[PDB]
Structures are given as C-alpha cells and as structure tokens.
Amino acid sequence: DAVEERVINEEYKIWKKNTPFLYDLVMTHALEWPSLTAQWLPDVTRPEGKDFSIHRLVLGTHTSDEQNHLVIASVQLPNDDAQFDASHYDSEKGEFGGFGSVSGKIEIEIKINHEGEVNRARYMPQNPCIIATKTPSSDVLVFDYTKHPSKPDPSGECNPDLRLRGHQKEGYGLSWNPNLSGHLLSASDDHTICLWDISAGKVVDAKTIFTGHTAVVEDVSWHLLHESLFGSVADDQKLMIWDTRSNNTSKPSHSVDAHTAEVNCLSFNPYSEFILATGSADKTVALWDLRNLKLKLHSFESHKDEIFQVQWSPHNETILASSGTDRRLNVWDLSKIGEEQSPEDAEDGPPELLFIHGGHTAKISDFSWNPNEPWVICSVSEDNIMQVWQMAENIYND
Amino acid sequence: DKKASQKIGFRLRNLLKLPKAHKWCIYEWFYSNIDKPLFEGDNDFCVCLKESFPNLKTRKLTRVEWGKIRRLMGKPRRCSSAFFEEERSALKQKRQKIRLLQDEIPLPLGTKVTARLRGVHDGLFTGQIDAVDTLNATYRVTFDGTHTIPDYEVLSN
Amino acid sequence: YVIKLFDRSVDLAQFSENTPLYPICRAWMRNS
Numbered sequence: 001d002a003v004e005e006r007v008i009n010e011e012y013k014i015w016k017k018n019t020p021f022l023y024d025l026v027m028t029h030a031l032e033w034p035s036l037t038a039q040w041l042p043d044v045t046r047p048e049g050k051d052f053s054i055h056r057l058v059l060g061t062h063t064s065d066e067q068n069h070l071v072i073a074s075v076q077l078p079n080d081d082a083q084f085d086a087s088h089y090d091s092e093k094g095e096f097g098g099f100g101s102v103s104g105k106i107e108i109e110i111k112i113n114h115e116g117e118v119n120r121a122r123y124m125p126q127n128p129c130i131i132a133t134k135t136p137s138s139d140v141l142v143f144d145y146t147k148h149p150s151k152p153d154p155s156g157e158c159n160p161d162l163r164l165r166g167h168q169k170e171g172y173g174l175s176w177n178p179n180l181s182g183h184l185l186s187a188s189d190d191h192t193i194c195l196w197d198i199s200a201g202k203v204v205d206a207k208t209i210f211t212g213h214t215a216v217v218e219d220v221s222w223h224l225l226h227e228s229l230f231g232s233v234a235d236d237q238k239l240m241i242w243d244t245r246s247n248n249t250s251k252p253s254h255s256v257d258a259h260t261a262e263v264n265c266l267s268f269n270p271y272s273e274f275i276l277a278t279g280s281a282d283k284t285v286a287l288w289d290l291r292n293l294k295l296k297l298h299s300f301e302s303h304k305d306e307i308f309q310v311q312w313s314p315h316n317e318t319i320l321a322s323s324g325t326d327r328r329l330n331v332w333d334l335s336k337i338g339e340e341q342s343p344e345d346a347e348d349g350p351p352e353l354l355f356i357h358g359g360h361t362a363k364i365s366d367f368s369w370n371p372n373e374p375w376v377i378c379s380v381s382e383d384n385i386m387q388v389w390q391m392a393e394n395i396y397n398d
Numbered sequence: 399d400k401k402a403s404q405k406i407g408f409r410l411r412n413l414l415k416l417p418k419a420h421k422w423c424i425y426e427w428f429y430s431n432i433d434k435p436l437f438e439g440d441n442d443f444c445v446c447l448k449e450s451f452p453n454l455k456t457r458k459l460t461r462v463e464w465g466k467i468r469r470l471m472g473k474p475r476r477c478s479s480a481f482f483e484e485e486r487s488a489l490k491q492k493r494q495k496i497r498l499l500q501d502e503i504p505l506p507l508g509t510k511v512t513a514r515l516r517g518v519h520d521g522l523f524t525g526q527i528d529a530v531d532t533l534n535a536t537y538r539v540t541f542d543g544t545h546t547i548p549d550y551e552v553l554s555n
Numbered sequence: 556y557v558i559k560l561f562d563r564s565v566d567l568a569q570f571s572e573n574t575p576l577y578p579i580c581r582a583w584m585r586n587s
Contacts, residue, residue: 013437014486014489015482018442018485021468028577029576031413031576063412083459086459094578095574349478384576394468395473397469406570409576410560410576423583521562553586
C-alpha cells in the first residue's frame with residue numbers, strides 16, 4: 001500500500017502546484033459521506049448586481065452504518081465580473097480547496113430520507129422538482145423535493161412520492177425521457193431494463209420490461225432526439241438499441257459486441273441523431289454511429305483502468321468526457337482526431353485528448369457538466385471529495 | 399451550545415473513519431519538513447506573473463483577465479501519466495537539492511515529530527527521532543515502536 | 556470545546572453545525 005499511496009500523494013501535490021495553468025476555476029469540497037451520484041439541476045439564480053450565480057446539485061450519500069439521504073446542495077459560481085486570486089491553490093485560508101468564487105461554498109439545502117445508499121439520482125427534464133432514485137432494495141424511488149421537509153425525520157423513515165417496481169435486483173442505470181414527460185428507464189443487476197410512465201397506490205408497476213441482456217445491465221440512456229429509441233450496455237459486453245414501438249421486448253433493434261469486457265455506461269450525443277459513446281471495463285471509450293454499429297467509429301484509449309461514466313458536453317457537439325477508476329476524468333475533442341501534433345505533445349496522449357483532470361484522489365463515481373456554465377464540471381469520488389472545476393479557456397481555444 | 403459542538407464532531411468522525419477520506423486529508427494538508435519549501439513558495443505561475451507582468455501588482459482579476467494572461471503564457475501540457483512521472487522525478491531532484499543544503503530552508507531534524515506510518519496502523523502518529531541517518535536520508539522514529547521513515551514523511555512537531 | 560479523534564485534536568468551538576467539512580478537516584490536520 002505504501003508504493004501506491006506515495007505516488008498518489010506526490011502526484012496530487014504536483015497537481016495542486018500546477019493548477020493555475022490548468023483551471024479557470026477549481027473548488028474542492030469534502031462531503032460527510034461520499035456520493036455515488038452527481039447531477040446539476042437545470043435552474044440558475046443570477047442575482048442582480050452580483051459577481052456570482054447560484055446553482056443546485058443533486059447528490060446522495062453512501063454509508064452502510066448510518067442513515068442515507070438524497071441531497072440537494074447549493075453552489076455559488078463566479079461569473080465574468082468576479083475577481084479572485086487564480087494564481088495558486090488555496091488550502092489554508094478558505095472554506096473550499098483551490099481558487100475561484102469567494103462565495104463558492106457548497107451548502108446543504110435539503111436532505112431527504114432514503115432507503116439505503118443512493119445508487120443514482122436524476123431529475124426529470126420536464127419538471128426538475130422530480131428526482132428519481134435507484135435504491136439497493138431494487139425499487140426505483142421518486143421524490144418531489146419541494147414537498148419534503150428541509151430537515152429529514154431522525155427516525156430515518158423514507159416516504160417516497162412514488163415507488164417504482166419491476167426489478168428484482170439493484171442497479172445503477174437511470175434515464176428520463178427528455179421528449180416524453182414521465183417516461184423513465186432503469187437498468188438493473190437482474191439483467192433487465194424497466195420502463196415506467198409515471199404520468200399514470202403510490203406504487204407503480206413497470207409499463208414494460210426489456211430482456212435482451214444476459215448479464216448485469218450497467219447503464220441505459222434515452223436517445224435525445226427520438227422518443228422511441230434508447231440504448232443499453234451490460235456486463236455481456238454488448239450495446240443494444242431499443243425501439244419502444246416494437247412489439248417484441250425480448251430482442252433489441254440492434255445488438256453489437258461493443259467492447260472486450262464489461263460495458264458500464266453510455267450517453268447519446270445531444271446534437272447528432274446518430275452519435276453515441278460507451279465506456280468499458282476494457283479502459284476504452286468507443287464512438288458509434290447508429291447508421292452502422294458494425295464497428296466503432298473511434299476508440300479513445302488514454303484511460304488506464306475501467307471507465308465508469310461518459311457524458312457529452314451540453315454546449316459543444318464534439319466534446320465528450322469520461323471518468324474511471326484510474327482516478328482521472330478525461331475530456332475529448334472529436335474534431336482533433338486525425339490531427340498532427342508535435343512529438344513533444346504525443347507523449348501526453350492522442351490529439352483528441354483535450355484535457356486530463358488529475359484533481360481526484362480516489363475512483364471517480366460520477367460527474368455532470370453544468371448546463372448553464374459552459375465547461376464547468378462537477379465530479380465526485382469515493383474518498384468523499386466533490387470537485388467543481390473548469391478547464392482553462394486557454395486549453396479549448398486557439 | 400455544546401449539543402452543536404458535539405454534532406459537528408459526529409460529522410467529522412464519519413468522514414475520518416472512512417480510510418479513503420482519511421488519506422485524502424494527508425494528501426491535502428500534510429507536507430513534511432523537506433517538502434514544505436518545494437510547495438509553499440511561489441509556483442511557476444506566480445514566478446511567471448512576477449517576471450513577465452511586472453506592472454501587475456494586484457492578484458484579484460476576472461476569468462477573462464486571467465485568460466488573457468494564460469494565453470500569453472502558452473498552452474499547458476496535458477496532465478499525462480508521463481507528465482506526472484517527469485514531475486515526480488523532478489521532485490526527487492528538488493529534494494536532494496534541499497537535502498545537501500542541510501538560508502530559510504528547514505533545518506535537519508530528540509526532536510518531537512509527526513510521522514506517516516502504514517500497514518497495521520495508518521495515521522500520522524507522534525514520536526521522537528531516535529536516530530538520524532543521512533545515508534538513505536531517513537530517520538528512526540520511536541512512537542509515543544521504532545521505524546525507519548523517509549524524511550519526506552516526517553513533520554517536525 | 557476540544558475533542559480527540561484518531562491521535563489528532565481539534566477545537567470545534569470555532570465552528571458551527573453549518574460549517575462544511577473542508578475547513579474542519581484542516582484544523583484537525585494542523586498542529587500546535
């Protein structure tokens with residue numbers, strides 16, 4: 001354990017020292033418990049005459065011998081009129097680590113009682129007050145956080161607004177249909193994908209169960225432009241494309257062997273109808289075109305361990321990020337794939353590797369792009385850290 | 399009053415009982431005696447600020463202004479694994495530089511110390527420098543048993 | 556209000572229940 005932790009320590013302190021060349025903004029916060037999930041709520045408050053805006057994050061807890069909570073936290077982010085010392089990572093004189101928004105502290109606004117750890121938590125696009133949550137009891141739970149108290153009952157009792165049934169095992173995949181209000185997908189260890197139309201007592205049985213996979217279904221995402229289409233990835237090393245119009249729910253529309261190992265996550269491009277990405281335990285991120293899934297358009301190889309999460313930028317068609325157990329979050333620029341680069345540069349990675357975030361000390365469980373502050377990312381890791389950060393503008397320009 | 403102070407401690411104890419979180423605390427704030435100069439001075443960014451922006455006396459500027467400065471300094475290297483490796487062995491050379499220097503760098507360390515100990519135990523514990531050894535650049539530390547510890551994992555007092 | 560927690564001590568009296576854990580960890584890690 002000493003050899004690994006000496007490398008990690010020095011590489012982390014090196015990273016802090018270098019953080020002024022690499023970030024417009026870095027904020028390190030310590031949660032009481034580590035979060036397995038992280039997602040920016042879509043609302044932003046821009047107070048009149050202030051040099052900060054207010055954002056909200058859906059997080060949860062992961063603890064085994066204390067009560068768990070769905071968490072809504074608040075973040076103050078700088079805007080362009082905010083003056084701060086970007087010249088060095090502060091760890092002694094403030095309430096977060098790094099530099100940026102003086103007021104940029106995370107604040108816990110709502111803790112809601114939950115049945116066990118929060119495997120994943122996502123808000124519904126058509127009504128961001130509604131968060132679906134994935135529990136270890138295999139239920140999917142729905143909360144309207146506006147109707148729950150700010151302080152949770154110390155009895156710990158969890159009172160979901162809806163309890164979605166259909167799974168027999170827990171899972172992590174969760175995706176709201178962005179073009180049909182209330183249509184939720186879920187991927188489970190029970191090898192099944194479950195669909196609910198919660199525009200339907202407080203318990204709801206699944207509208208539809210898709211059974212193509214033969215192992216743990218790691219992730220599921222709706223296609224962002226086609227209300228009938230969604231993708232899934234599983235421990236059977238397959239990517240599968242499903243059409244809710246089809247009468248057969250035991251067979252996908254398309255089924256490719258996507259990677260040489262388990263496939264953990266996928267995400268559809270918010271601008272192209274045909275582009276999506278998967279991430280795999282084979283340390284690869286694969287790019288895919290729906291017009292011919294018969295082989296990868298491209299494989300992004302710089303990660304050094306299992307990749308557990310991928311997300312397209314919401315502001316830029318050709319920007320993609322991935323996160324893994326190698327303690328790194330990589331940002332890719334698809335437009336740079338064939339590019340020529342200096343032999344100096346080639347030692348640091350392919351030209352499509354835009355940026356490497358070395359800010360996390362343990363495995364990164366999840367990250368979200370901010371939908372209102374371009375290039376700002378929130379990422380969380382298994383050592384309780386939540387980092388809110390923004391790559392230097394210098395890097396993604398010329 | 400004291401209910402509140404106690405609840406703060408319950409929150410703190412829950413983070414610190416988690417070993418990954420516990421080691422993050424070491425990574426964030428724990429700098430040995432020889433490493434403090436290597437990290438607590440001016441970084442290269444602050445050096446470049448002082449040398450190529452000599453009329454800039456403030457350090458409170460906007461992202462945009464900071465941007466204009468970083469575009470003058472050129473694009474950074476991606477924090478590759480090769481990059482951290484080059485930076486790691488630079489850190490090994492900076493350490494020896496400080497070392498043979500033994501004039502406000504730290505003095506060589508019966509000095510009461512806080513030392514990184516691993517394995518069975520896994521915190522930073524207090525103790526005495528039983529023996530100094532400039533041979534492998536290590537110290538014998540007797541804990542309040544005795545262990546040979548690198549100097550970059552021993553903090554004075 | 557000073558507590559002992561895993562061979563280090565910290566005076567939590569300067570903090571409040573709303574204080575985030577980052578600055579409290581620091582005080583726990585700092586010395587004399």
